[PDB]
């Protein structure tokens, strides 16, 4: 199993308190003892930023809920200080998730006095960490599967929320990592892996071959489209394009392999052989082109075992004509997977720290 996940964006420590302590008294007069409610609490928010975006990470629900909490919070803090005319002074500096920068002095950074920019990069890290948690799941068990599928669909919907949002939300030209192109592609990647997780669930549950083939066929589409978005781009890490190329073929081969079990079941022995020849050809291409990225050995053997048996008996007994691929019916497509919309609150049991403001 070879799953793609995204590295978290770096940020630098900022004193979120100082710049907000000030902009709290206006025609809210209480300069006596009342304002200090919106202050011990407006730096529970500051230590929350440091917890959310501050340490090297736990890849568990612990660290993820903190990031989600922090995202919920900034979204709620937005209109309090009417930020259509921004006059709170705060500058958030984030490093590009992907761009190295030349070792001709330093990385690729962007500093912006914006809540827009902040909530964007935070949601990036929520999506990215969720992708990391998904990829670490043990897929040999049902709850491993359930958690990977849940988080891949979350990360897909969250990268996609950034796509439709970064440009309006920000003033400047985004870094390439959060720009709509990169993030539309990450979103598709996550959605493809979520679909793969469903195929892997049908496979564990030894569900019907017709079903597994339609799940596999839809995954091949998602992976196909994602690699096409990366063909002419070198934004994402180098392993990404070859992994997506290989899984587009592996998923096509799974579709053909399972649809071939259905053929055999229905005594269409020539169609069985034709589908299995396709599957072996796909897997042979992956084995020779992408082998430093995937191990396709057991599957290749399994196909080659079914093909050999099918051919012996067709040549000896049935003498069905092996049809041409273009004369076979298309395998269907079954999608079981959506980009999860971002609707604050996204964190579990959220309470707004500034709810009475």
């Amino acid at each position: 199993a070879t799953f793609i996940s995204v590295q978290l964006k770096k940020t630098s420590e900022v004193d979120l308190a100082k710049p907000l302590v000030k902009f709290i008294q206006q025609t809210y007069p209480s300069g006596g003892e009342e304002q200090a409610q919106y202050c011990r609490a407006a730096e529970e928010l500051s230590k929350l930023r440091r917890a959310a975006v501050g340490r090297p990470l736990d890849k568990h629900e612990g660290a993820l809920e903190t990031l989600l909490r922090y995202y919920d919070q900034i979204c709620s803090i937005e209109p309090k200080f009417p930020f259509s005319e921004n006059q709170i002074c705060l500058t958030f500096t984030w490093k590009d998730a992907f761009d190295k920068g030349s070792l001709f002095g330093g990385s690729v950074k962007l500093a912006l006095a914006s809540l827009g920019y902040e909530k964007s990069c935070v949601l990036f890290n929520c999506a990215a960490l969720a992708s990391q948690i998904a990829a670490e799941q043990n897929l040999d068990n049902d709850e491993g599967l359930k958690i990977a599928a849940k988080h891949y669909q979350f990360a897909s919907g969250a990268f996609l929320h950034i796509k439709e949002t970064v440009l309006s939300a920000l003033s400047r030209e985004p870094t390439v990592d959060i720009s709509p192109d990169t993030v539309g592609t990450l979103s598709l990647i996550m959605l493809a892996q979520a679909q793969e997780v469903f195929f892997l669930k049908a496979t564990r549950d030894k569900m019907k071959d017709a079903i597994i083939a339609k799940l596999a066929n839809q995954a091949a589409d998602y992976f196909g489209d994602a690699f096409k978005q990366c063909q002419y781009k070198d934004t994402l890490p180098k392993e990404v394009f070859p992994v997506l190329a290989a899984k587009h073929c592996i998923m096509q081969a799974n579709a053909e392999y399972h649809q071939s079990i259905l053929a055999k079941q229905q005594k269409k022995f020539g169609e069985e052989i034709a589908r299995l020849q396709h599957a072996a050809e796909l897997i042979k291409t992956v084995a020779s082109r992408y082998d430093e990225y995937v191990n396709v050995k057991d599957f290749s053997d399994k196909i080659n075992r079914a093909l050999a048996a099918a051919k012996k008996d067709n040549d000896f007994i049935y003498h069905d004509r092996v049809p041409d691929l273009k004369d076979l019916d298309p395998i269907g497509k079954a999608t079981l997977v959506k980009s999860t919309p971002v609707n604050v609150p996204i964190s579990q049991k959220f309470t707004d720290l500034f709810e009475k403001m």
């Binding site: 359930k146 599928a149 849940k150 669909q153 469903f198 669930k201 049908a202 549950d205 569900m207 019907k208 017709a210 079903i211 079954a334 079981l336 997977v337």
Partner: peptide
């Protein structure tokens, strides 16, 4: 097709229980 109910449905339930 009486199991393509029984299989598709039980993943649409796995799905909603997320």
């Amino acid at each position: 097709k009486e199991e393509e109910d029984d299989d598709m449905k039980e993943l649409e339930n796995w799905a909603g229980s997320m």
